[PDB]
Point group: C2
Chain length 257, copies 2
């Protein structure tokens, strides 16, 4: 059940920017410009996810401090899957990150827990790191099933026997995505504590304290500092605000003072 | 109707293998009587566009129904155009049956893509069980009726008939089977749209097309080209492009 003890600050912070279906050469140029000019908050792993057609472009222009990730991928390296990309391609492009299980993939494009778990297992085997997304819908939280949803989504990869060194868990309540309805620091902290409790029992105390757990869902330059006060929130997954200069303010808010 | 040959690389490719394909394609001379389009995986679209001779156009393997928005993992016609491309494959069997894209979603994608000013290779095809049950005509017509219902125009649409049972199995449709379906498709277009559209719309065949059968399939008058998967990854793809030469 939902643990109570707060974690110590023993994990490297993480701030990811998911551009979603946004971007063209000109706008990507603009983003890369403010990202490169930003201070190199070495205390924070910074990752951005451009749409597939702009992955190589972004990597060629970004400073070493900003890593590039794919927004999704499939479960085999090569094959007859029109419209899909694989970890092999991600590696070929010189990238080492991928976002899997994003709310939009699960609820707009119907990706199942099983599929997402298979993708995760394969991506990890390939040597790429994964930002594993989980989260409940408003009706589910109101029915008191926040824990049940997150448990199932996480158990899906535990059952596949994945290792956790290269996994960053992103808790993103569906109701907070692009709605401005940000979870309160308290609400987020309690879910993150529960997630660590889950990891402690399902895996090990070591994994629980080493695994980064970031919050996503209407994170803005104005609430980042406030949310970052919670020891169990190791960073954020940013959507809309990752397309603007405010993304830098969010990174600065998370970095060591 | 000018011959149309498309190469769908599907989820295949890295810089090295893409370079190999670009090499044999660039080595070939252009054929005035054949339009050639290849569809690289999304991460290599720009790379392929910069490396390929002007005679070969690049197409995206899929896209969504809005120009921009919160749809992680999706690309749009706006991006396709920004990349300098003018083609997209929609409704491919793998999207419909492996990733569950509905007839309605595909029709909406098609409407949006055409509105954006890009051309569409609209894919349709029945499964083995549907053909055995006598619904080849029904299934293919239903998939087409979906865009007819949306009121799309057809000047920028190439129809790709690819029976599911013939994809990557080596179980190629015979020339007679394909010709029969393409004739039905034109009848559908002549009735639902117009005689002009029925005669102008290019209908290409896909499903285990190889250098061994392309020449023979190409002799059927209602087949206006091919959509090639596995065979598009090797040099003999050029023999398919020149199927009517």
């Amino acid at each position: 059940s939902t643990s109570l003890y707060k974690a110590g600050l023993t994990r490297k912070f993480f701030v990811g920017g998911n551009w979603k279906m946004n971007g063209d050469y000109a706008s990507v140029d603009g983003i890369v410009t403010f990202l490169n000019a930003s201070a190199d908050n070495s205390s924070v792993d910074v990752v951005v996810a451009p749409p597939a057609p702009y992955l190589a472009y972004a990597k060629s222009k970004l400073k070493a401090g900003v890593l590039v990730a794919a927004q999704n991928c499939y479960k085999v390296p090569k094959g007859a899957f029109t419209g899909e990309i694989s970890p092999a391609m991600i590696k070929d492009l010189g990238l080492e990150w991928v976002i899997l299980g994003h709310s939009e993939r699960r609820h707009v494009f119907g990706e199942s827990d099983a599929l997402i778990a298979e993708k995760t297992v394969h991506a990890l085997e390939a040597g790429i790191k994964v930002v594993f997304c989980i989260g409940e819908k408003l009706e589910e939280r109101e029915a008191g099933h926040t824990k049940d949803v997150n448990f199932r989504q996480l158990q899906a990869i535990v059952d596949k026997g994945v290792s956790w060194e290269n996994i960053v868990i992103a808790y993103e309540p569906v109701w907070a995505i692009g709605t401005g309805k940000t979870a309160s620091g308290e609400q987020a902290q309690e879910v993150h504590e529960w997630i660590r409790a889950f990891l402690k029992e399902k895996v090990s105390p070591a994994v629980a304290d080493a695994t980064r757990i970031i919050y996503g869902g209407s994170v803005t330059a104005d609430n980042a500092a406030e949310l970052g006060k919670k020891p169990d929130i190791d960073g954020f997954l940013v959507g809309g605000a990752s397309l603007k200069p405010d993304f830098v303010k969010i990174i600065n808010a998370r970095s060591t003072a």
